[PDB]
Symmetry: none
Subunit: 269 residues, 4 copies
């Protein structure tokens, strides 16, 4: 019998291909599935939550600062899906554990997880560049969600990352260049292999998107972006939402360990 070089828990090989719909549009359906989206009281995370609701999923919403029950109640009126909001401090392991357990018990499972790590940046008494992904909350999130995925034998986990050309740090790897994307890719490629018997794991790397994350900058700094972006502009949040659905749905049942770049072309070797 043929045994994996990557993970002997896959069993005798080959693992056997899923049964997909004959129709490509059905592949993108999240009807019947439960998504848990962090950072979904604004910016990317909200945009993704609403798309997932449009695709038929029940959506768990994460807030902390400003309550998001009206966003949850809006997903129900508008789309007739189940949605509840959860107050959680994403960097507290005990509440990330508490909150996932609460969502599983409330929805019955979690099929799709989007880890949107919260973002800071300094401000003293004074300003005139460097933003920070809280990778630790990603870690706590994936540790918890992985357990559920194993027990159910199915799961998609998307980690929001970044492009190399954006100076994005993690709190324990501060530098004047991007350190966060190597850290996310590592965390992603590692889980992809570990979780291979039961889940796919992937990253979305947005570029410069007109949203609460870069909407600290001035029109003069934003101008430096448009000049370097081959498409000549910033992205809209509605231009990431399709990729977050590609990765979460049965459209990507062979896609794991990957990074889909949505940056208007900014990467470019």
């Amino acid at each position: 019998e043929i045994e994996s070089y990557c993970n002997k828990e896959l069993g005798p090989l080959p693992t056997k291909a899923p049964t997909l719909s004959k129709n490509v549009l059905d592949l993108f359906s999240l009807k019947g599935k439960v998504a848990s989206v962090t950072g979904s009281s604004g910016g990317i995370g909200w945009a993704v939550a609403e798309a997932y609701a449009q695709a038929g999923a029940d959506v768990a919403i994460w807030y902390n600062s400003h309550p998001a029950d009206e966003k949850a109640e809006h997903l129900q009126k508008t789309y007739g899906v189940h949605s509840k909001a959860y107050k959680c401090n994403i960097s507290d392991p005990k509440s990330v554990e508490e909150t996932i357990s609460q969502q599983e018990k409330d929805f019955g499972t979690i099929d799709v997880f989007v880890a949107n790590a919260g973002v800071t940046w300094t401000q003293g008494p004074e300003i005139d560049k460097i933003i920070s992904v809280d990778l630790n909350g990603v870690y706590y999130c994936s540790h918890n969600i992985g357990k559920i995925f194993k027990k159910n034998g199915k799961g998609s986990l998307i980690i929001t990352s970044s492009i190399s050309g954006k100076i994005v740090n993690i709190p324990q790897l501060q530098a004047p260049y991007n350190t966060a994307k190597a850290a996310c890719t590592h965390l992603a490629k590692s889980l992809a292999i570990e979780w291979a018997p039961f889940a796919r794991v992937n990253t979305i790397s947005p570029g410069y998107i007109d949203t609460d994350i870069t909407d600290f900058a001035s029109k003069d700094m934003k101008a430096k972006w448009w000049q370097l972006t081959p498409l000549g502009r910033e992205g809209l949040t509605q231009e990431l939402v399709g990729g977050y659905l590609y990765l979460a749905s049965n459209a990507s049942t062979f896609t794991t360990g990957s990074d889909v770049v949505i940056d208007g072309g900014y990467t470019c070797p």
Copy 2:
């Protein structure tokens, strides 16, 4: 007035964001759009061809020695879209120029193009030349003609499929042509940015026509190296092609979507 640093045909910056439906599913619709898809008498090409038709697009399929007007008939009857199969020689640029010219006349426009030269289907000097002509020049020939239609319409999406032949001594030509294709696709994305997105699809070991020959002792060596523990199916590439072709991906260009079951990308 903020001029661009990648390409100046963008004009005064920022370029405008396109109008997008506010619902996700509508973004993947090809209704009202026309796709042309090489190597679509079988394998990945045909899978992509059927998928685009299901998404609501008219589809022009391509073929070599294996006539496929019946495969066009099938799309037309099944999905209520216009379809026509074209015989072509991707290695000769005049046929590529002719075929794409035809397709624009018969269909009105081309909104979507998929070059599948690398995933379609005895002296080593001649072997090198043939692969390069097909897998590299064929891709470039298609590029030049479809860029005119894209440039003269202000809209377009181009997909280039990275070969997997060369994962299956004889590998150097296939992988060199793949390399050159990856570069050309990035250069085109910069150049067509005022009017077209350009991306590549990179499949892993797909169970389809181009892997039919491989020994079971061969295929077994793939299964243990790819983390998902198997080969892919054509029905697992199809969604990636819909994403790139459609309005779901209007802000993504110059990117490579890898679909390989984890074979460290």
Copy 3:
């Protein structure tokens, strides 16, 4: 063999033998006793390397297509005291590549160093259409490099020795027709990494990547084009061929016996 290799099981039982090298750093750069073949050495970069290897003490087979060059080889023989001969070849002709490289093996006995300069030589006149330019450029700058390597690899493998240098081109940073040029360069860089693996029991393979050099391949450029080159280069100027020559000696010689699959960039900081 007990410890086998993942990259080339043709390496035999690991570790492979450490090479045996002079105790003096300066002796590592000597090409006495070895034979080098430099294509496109009628003039330009090809000539400068061809002459510098000769000062370094190596027999030099030089290449030409248009302007004959027996007079240049004689100059190498006359000035430096090394065997030198000039050969004619359409680098795009696989058949001509084979015989040309076969001939030099015969006249010289071996080839220790090879420098594929197709990307910096003007043999790649009025172009019919854009498809013709493309096919021309791919034929010289990619397929031509390939034919060379296939033939020198037989002799490299036969002899258990070899340094192959592929020169990355400069055209495409100039003045479009930049797409075939850069596309052919990209394919060469991948080719060179492939060869680095598969020839590892017997030879090294490396690329040299020059920036803007003041030489025959830029001898047409406007002052308007060249000024922007100066403006974006950290050193603030163009290069001289005498600033390329030391890196080619580095790769060709025993100075770099542990460097393969690498890219030596000589561009005044242009890429950052």
Copy 4:
């Protein structure tokens, strides 16, 4: 047209800058006669081999040590090669020790023409261990900062920073991770220095692969066997296979070479 100002560093003046004047004989390009080299970490493995190469190539040589006295190595260079050599005790982590050491080196030798920054290496020991090394870039930064002042005043210089290859897991203390982080930080220093020092000095990194030395006199046979297995050339390299590129970058063989990474890893870095 008129005067043309650079878009990198405007201290270059109206472009183009004048090319240096070079010997027409390639073998003269690699000579260091008339030049002074200062090589840190040179009581040790790579450092010593580079120091000695530079002496063979004709250079006076300032060698650096902290724990193991190196007065005998300086004397060995003078006697063997006929060249001025002196040894300096300096803790490369003390920014003040570095400043005085390079000032003292300027006096004794008159100038410094070539500098090689070798960060000290550490690994982790403990009861539960029988794979990550880290290098202290601070010392590289202090040395880079002070040698720049000499290079600027004199209008010439060559600085080489020893870096690492991505496939070897090398950290710096402020960037711990399960993958190489020190190469990116070295490429970043070398790239910013090459731009800022453009009017007067060249700046490059050398990234060695797996070398048979004393930074790696701490690895079992079974670890080394896995490095052999993934290196195209099939072995560890020798320091004498490094010393070439260190001379290439130091000498006038590379006057057009700044901002670059010279990888000497027997092919270990590959797509």
